[PDB]
Amino acid sequence: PQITLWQRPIVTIKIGGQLKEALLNTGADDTVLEEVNLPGRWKPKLIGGIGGFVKVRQYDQVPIEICGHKVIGTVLVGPTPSNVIGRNLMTQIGCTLNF
Amino acid sequence: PQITLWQRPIVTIKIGGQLKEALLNTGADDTVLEEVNLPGRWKPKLIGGIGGFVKVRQYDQVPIEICGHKVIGTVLVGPTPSNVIGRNLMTQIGCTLNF
Protein backbone atom coordinates (compact mmCIF):
# COMPACT_ATOMS: atom_id res chain seq x y z
CA PRO A 1 0.00 0.00 0.00
CA GLN A 2 0.86 3.65 0.21
CA ILE A 3 0.71 4.86 3.84
CA THR A 4 0.36 8.58 4.52
CA LEU A 5 1.87 9.89 7.75
CA TRP A 6 -0.89 12.03 9.21
CA GLN A 7 -1.50 9.26 11.70
CA ARG A 8 1.01 6.85 13.28
CA PRO A 9 1.72 4.11 10.75
CA ILE A 10 0.43 1.22 12.80
CA VAL A 11 -0.11 -2.05 10.94
CA THR A 12 -1.19 -5.63 11.72
CA ILE A 13 1.56 -8.19 11.89
CA LYS A 14 1.17 -11.89 12.34
CA ILE A 15 3.98 -13.45 14.34
CA GLY A 16 4.35 -16.86 15.98
CA GLY A 17 0.61 -17.55 15.43
CA GLN A 18 -0.58 -14.28 17.01
CA LEU A 19 -1.89 -11.12 15.25
CA LYS A 20 -0.46 -7.88 16.64
CA GLU A 21 -0.27 -4.16 15.94
CA ALA A 22 3.14 -2.62 15.36
CA LEU A 23 4.52 0.82 14.34
CA LEU A 24 6.39 1.12 11.00
CA ASN A 25 9.39 2.99 12.37
CA THR A 26 12.08 4.13 9.97
CA GLY A 27 14.00 5.70 12.90
CA ALA A 28 14.48 2.17 14.35
CA ASP A 29 17.24 -0.04 13.08
CA ASP A 30 15.77 -3.25 14.53
CA THR A 31 12.36 -4.71 15.15
CA VAL A 32 11.30 -4.97 18.81
CA LEU A 33 8.18 -6.78 19.99
CA GLU A 34 6.47 -7.06 23.37
CA GLU A 35 5.06 -10.35 24.68
CA VAL A 36 5.54 -13.08 22.06
CA ASN A 37 6.98 -16.58 22.80
CA LEU A 38 9.00 -17.61 19.80
CA PRO A 39 10.35 -21.11 19.30
CA GLY A 40 14.00 -21.90 18.58
CA ARG A 41 17.32 -20.49 19.82
CA TRP A 42 18.03 -16.91 20.69
CA LYS A 43 20.99 -14.87 21.83
CA PRO A 44 20.86 -11.99 24.34
CA LYS A 45 21.23 -8.57 22.76
CA LEU A 46 21.65 -5.14 24.33
CA ILE A 47 19.51 -2.37 22.78
CA GLY A 48 18.78 1.22 23.75
CA GLY A 49 21.88 2.82 25.39
CA ILE A 50 20.41 6.08 26.65
CA GLY A 51 20.10 5.70 30.49
CA GLY A 52 21.35 2.17 30.32
CA PHE A 53 20.82 -0.69 27.93
CA VAL A 54 17.79 -2.98 27.70
CA LYS A 55 18.50 -6.68 27.30
CA VAL A 56 16.28 -8.54 24.82
CA ARG A 57 16.19 -11.89 23.06
CA GLN A 58 17.32 -11.94 19.41
CA TYR A 59 15.72 -14.58 17.20
CA ASP A 60 16.91 -14.62 13.57
CA GLN A 61 15.21 -15.75 10.38
CA VAL A 62 11.85 -15.42 11.97
CA PRO A 63 8.71 -15.77 9.72
CA ILE A 64 6.48 -12.72 10.05
CA GLU A 65 3.62 -11.32 8.04
CA ILE A 66 3.57 -7.52 7.94
CA CYS A 67 0.52 -6.15 6.33
CA GLY A 68 0.06 -9.33 4.28
CA HIS A 69 3.69 -9.65 3.20
CA LYS A 70 5.38 -12.83 4.39
CA VAL A 71 8.98 -12.12 5.13
CA ILE A 72 11.85 -13.46 7.19
CA GLY A 73 13.84 -11.32 9.61
CA THR A 74 15.52 -10.86 12.93
CA VAL A 75 13.03 -10.08 15.67
CA LEU A 76 14.09 -8.78 19.08
CA VAL A 77 11.81 -9.82 21.97
CA GLY A 78 11.39 -8.15 25.38
CA PRO A 79 10.14 -4.96 27.14
CA THR A 80 9.05 -2.12 24.80
CA PRO A 81 6.70 0.94 25.25
CA SER A 82 5.27 -0.11 21.84
CA ASN A 83 5.75 -2.91 19.22
CA VAL A 84 8.15 -1.58 16.56
CA ILE A 85 8.82 -2.75 12.99
CA GLY A 86 12.32 -1.46 12.23
CA ARG A 87 14.19 -0.87 8.95
CA ASN A 88 15.50 -4.40 9.00
CA LEU A 89 11.99 -5.73 8.29
CA MET A 90 10.84 -2.77 6.16
CA THR A 91 13.57 -3.66 3.67
CA GLN A 92 12.32 -7.26 3.47
CA ILE A 93 8.78 -6.14 2.56
CA GLY A 94 10.17 -3.66 -0.01
CA CYS A 95 9.04 -0.60 1.98
CA THR A 96 10.50 2.66 0.78
CA LEU A 97 9.97 6.34 1.71
CA ASN A 98 8.58 8.39 -1.22
CA PHE A 99 7.97 12.07 -2.02
CA PRO B 1 12.87 10.54 -4.34
CA GLN B 2 12.37 6.96 -3.32
CA ILE B 3 14.47 6.13 -0.22
CA THR B 4 15.24 2.50 0.55
CA LEU B 5 15.73 1.57 4.20
CA TRP B 6 18.91 -0.48 4.18
CA GLN B 7 20.67 2.51 5.65
CA ARG B 8 19.31 5.15 8.07
CA PRO B 9 17.29 7.63 6.03
CA ILE B 10 19.37 10.68 6.76
CA VAL B 11 18.74 13.72 4.57
CA THR B 12 19.96 17.33 4.27
CA ILE B 13 17.65 19.97 5.61
CA LYS B 14 18.11 23.69 5.39
CA ILE B 15 16.76 25.53 8.40
CA GLY B 16 17.21 29.11 9.62
CA GLY B 17 20.06 29.63 7.09
CA GLN B 18 22.01 26.50 8.12
CA LEU B 19 22.27 23.14 6.28
CA LYS B 20 21.90 20.10 8.55
CA GLU B 21 21.48 16.34 8.45
CA ALA B 22 18.34 14.85 9.95
CA LEU B 23 16.73 11.36 10.19
CA LEU B 24 13.38 10.77 8.41
CA ASN B 25 11.64 9.15 11.37
CA THR B 26 8.11 7.85 10.91
CA GLY B 27 8.10 6.65 14.55
CA ALA B 28 8.36 10.33 15.67
CA ASP B 29 5.29 12.48 15.84
CA ASP B 30 7.20 15.78 15.93
CA THR B 31 10.37 17.19 14.48
CA VAL B 32 13.21 17.80 16.95
CA LEU B 33 16.42 19.63 16.09
CA GLU B 34 19.67 20.21 17.98
CA GLU B 35 21.45 23.57 17.98
CA VAL B 36 19.56 26.03 15.75
CA ASN B 37 18.64 29.63 16.77
CA LEU B 38 15.30 30.40 15.22
CA PRO B 39 13.78 33.87 15.16
CA GLY B 40 10.29 34.69 16.43
CA ARG B 41 8.19 33.52 19.38
CA TRP B 42 8.17 30.07 20.87
CA LYS B 43 6.33 28.26 23.62
CA PRO B 44 7.87 25.65 25.96
CA LYS B 45 6.82 22.10 25.19
CA LEU B 46 7.41 18.86 27.10
CA ILE B 47 8.47 15.88 24.94
CA GLY B 48 9.72 12.40 25.75
CA GLY B 49 8.02 11.07 28.94
CA ILE B 50 10.04 7.91 29.55
CA GLY B 51 12.34 8.69 32.57
CA GLY B 52 11.08 12.22 32.73
CA PHE B 53 10.17 14.79 30.13
CA VAL B 54 12.53 16.95 28.08
CA LYS B 55 11.61 20.61 27.74
CA VAL B 56 12.10 22.13 24.28
CA ARG B 57 11.13 25.28 22.40
CA GLN B 58 8.23 24.97 19.94
CA TYR B 59 8.32 27.32 16.95
CA ASP B 60 5.38 27.02 14.54
CA GLN B 61 5.08 27.75 10.84
CA VAL B 62 8.78 27.49 10.41
CA PRO B 63 10.22 27.50 6.81
CA ILE B 64 12.37 24.43 6.22
CA GLU B 65 13.76 22.74 3.15
CA ILE B 66 13.86 18.95 3.44
CA CYS B 67 15.62 17.34 0.60
CA GLY B 68 14.83 20.27 -1.69
CA HIS B 69 11.17 20.58 -0.70
CA LYS B 70 10.28 23.92 0.87
CA VAL B 71 7.65 23.39 3.49
CA ILE B 72 6.29 25.03 6.61
CA GLY B 73 5.96 23.22 9.92
CA THR B 74 6.32 23.17 13.65
CA VAL B 75 9.92 22.60 14.70
CA LEU B 76 10.88 21.70 18.27
CA VAL B 77 14.32 22.97 19.37
CA GLY B 78 16.55 21.65 22.18
CA PRO B 79 18.64 18.63 23.33
CA THR B 80 18.40 15.53 21.08
CA PRO B 81 20.72 12.46 20.53
CA SER B 82 20.07 13.10 16.79
CA ASN B 83 18.19 15.63 14.55
CA VAL B 84 14.78 14.10 13.74
CA ILE B 85 12.27 14.90 10.98
CA GLY B 86 8.94 13.65 12.35
CA ARG B 87 5.63 12.78 10.66
CA ASN B 88 4.44 16.33 11.03
CA LEU B 89 6.99 17.47 8.42
CA MET B 90 6.92 14.27 6.33
CA THR B 91 3.26 14.98 5.60
CA GLN B 92 4.10 18.50 4.39
CA ILE B 93 6.63 17.18 1.85
CA GLY B 94 4.16 14.49 0.69
CA CYS B 95 6.27 11.62 2.09
CA THR B 96 4.50 8.30 2.20
CA LEU B 97 5.55 4.72 3.09
CA ASN B 98 5.22 2.33 0.10
CA PHE B 99 5.43 -1.43 -0.51
TrEMBL record, chains A, B:
<protein>
    <submittedName>
        <fullName>Pol protein</fullName>
    </submittedName>
</protein>
<feature type="domain" description="Peptidase A2">
    <location>
        <begin position="20"/>
        <end position="89"/>
    </location>
</feature>
<comment type="similarity">
    <text>Belongs to the retroviral Pol polyprotein family.</text>
</comment>
